[PDB]
Amino acid sequence: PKLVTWMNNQRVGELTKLANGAHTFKYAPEWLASRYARPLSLSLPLQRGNITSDAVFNFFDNLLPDSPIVRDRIVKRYHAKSRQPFDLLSEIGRDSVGAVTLIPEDPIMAWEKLTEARLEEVLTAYAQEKTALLRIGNDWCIPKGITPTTHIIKLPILDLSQSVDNEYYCLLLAKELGLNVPDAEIIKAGNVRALAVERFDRRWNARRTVLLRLPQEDMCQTFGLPSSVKYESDGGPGIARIMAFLMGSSEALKDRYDFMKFQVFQWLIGATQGHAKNFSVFIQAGGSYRLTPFYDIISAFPVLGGTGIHISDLKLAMGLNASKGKKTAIDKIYPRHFLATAKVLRFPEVQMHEILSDFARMIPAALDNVKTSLPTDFPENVVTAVESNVLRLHGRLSREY
Ligand SMILES: [Cl-]
């Protein structure tokens, strides 16, 4: 009942599942002795004894997809012993988010190039269902052994049939507006259209002979919480808890500014799904941390008017301060709410003003610039929907900034 936990080529410790179902973790002495040792999670601090808190089960369970439907698929695909976490990671824990590599108790870089036909096949087998591949030059490949992947691959997902184009667009816009986000590309293989997002939890060495995994954990993990409480309405962290947390980042000022800037950005693009698991931090040597780039960005604008949903129904996953409580409706949110929030969280008014004024003058040019990076077959309705609504909200920044 053990899975050895590795960080690149270093043994970190072991995950054990006792006979009664309890999960425990124990760091390896060689790991702890390193003057550069870092915990697996800020919720699992470095220590010599057996860790038995719920933070253990929660940390590892948060490495898996949230969806029971996706988990059944995983058990079926690898014939996993059960749907239980320990058993799923026994099958797919070799390459996961961050740098944790889980290998059953019972290297050289190598890979296999895939043909367009083969790539189409691989992708047609896949909250949503996502996989990962290794990019070598302009070819998509399957890594061999412990060789890591470099890109998260997402398939189309309320008609969220254009979620691939939606996210591509949002990521391009975020980058154009100065936000820290991964690059992405729309890949076409036969009749499949998927989004390949470059992973920021991976890094090639200078000579390109070794691809390293970078340790990171999302906000539920960092707080020892189960994925079940990822939404603030369920007791999960919101802007206040995360901002407080970021005070201790090795890049406090830049991370708080970036996180606040991103809240304004989600509001402008109608991103209604920015829950706690959509934020992560890199865990660095010694246990210090800093915010990773932003990810999993999708606009709810292209889904408007569909199932009868109006713009008035769009709500931010993490609310802002309101005179009498919180402000969550994108359609009712204005700059005063961001400034009121900045104030109570001790985020400088001058910085909040800069963020608002920068979007005020840059949005129109950013929207035009993004168009050159869209493929000829990009769905116009997505551009139309996001563009018109972003400009509509952007007007509110101009009637003051
Ligand atoms: Cl509201």
From Swiss-Prot:
Top-tier EC class: transferase
Keywords: Antibiotic resistance, ATP-binding, DNA-binding, Kinase, Nucleotide-binding, Phosphoprotein, Repressor, Serine/threonine-protein kinase, Toxin-antitoxin system, Transferase
One GO CC annotation: cytosol
Residue positions binding ATP: A127, Q128, E129, K130, K154, E198, R199, F200, H275, A276, K277, N278, Y295, D296
Location of the DNA-binding region in this protein: 343-346
Gene Ontology BP terms: dormancy process; regulation of DNA-templated transcription; regulation of growth; response to antibiotic; single-species biofilm formation
Active-site residues, record numbering mapped to chain: Q273 (proton acceptor)
EC number: 2.7.11.1
Keyword Magnesium appears in the UniProt entry: no
Disruption phenotype: A hipA or a hipB-hipA operon deletion have no visible phenotype. Initially cells lacking hipA or the hipBA operon were thought not to produce persister cells at a high frequency; this was later shown to be a strain-specific phenotype. A hipA or a hipB-hipA operon deletion show decreased biofilm production in the absence of antibiotics.
InterPro entries noted in UniProt: HipA-like_C, HipA_N1, HipA_Ser/Thr_kinase
Pfam entry (one): Couple_hipA
Gene Ontology MF, one: transcription cis-regulatory region binding
Catalytic activity: L-seryl-[protein] + ATP = O-phospho-L-seryl-[protein] + ADP + H(+); L-threonyl-[protein] + ATP = O-phospho-L-threonyl-[protein] + ADP + H(+)
Presence of the UniProt keyword Ubl conjugation in the record: no
Oligomeric and partner information: Forms a HipA(2)HipB(2) heterotetramer which can interact with a single operator on DNA. When 2 operators are present each HipB dimer contacts 1 HipA molecule, which are brought together by the DNA bend and dimerize, blocking the HipA active site and inactivating its toxic activity. Mutations present in allele hipA7 (G22S and D291A) decrease the affinity of HipA for HipB.
Function: Toxic component of a type II toxin-antitoxin (TA) system, first identified by mutations that increase production of persister cells, a fraction of cells that are phenotypic variants not killed by antibiotics, which lead to multidrug tolerance. Persistence may be ultimately due to global remodeling of the persister cell's ribosomes. Phosphorylates Glu-tRNA-ligase (AC P04805, gltX, on 'Ser-239') in vivo. Phosphorylation of GltX prevents it from being charged, leading to an increase in uncharged tRNA(Glu).
Entry similarity comment: Belongs to the HipA Ser/Thr kinase family.
Misc: The hipA7 allele (G22S and D291A) as well as a P86L mutation have been identified in E.coli isolates from human patients with urinary tract infections, showing the mutations may be clinically relevant.
NCBIfam families per record: couple_hipA (TIGR03071)
Name of protein: Serine/threonine-protein kinase toxin HipA
The organism of origin for this protein: Escherichia coli (strain K12)
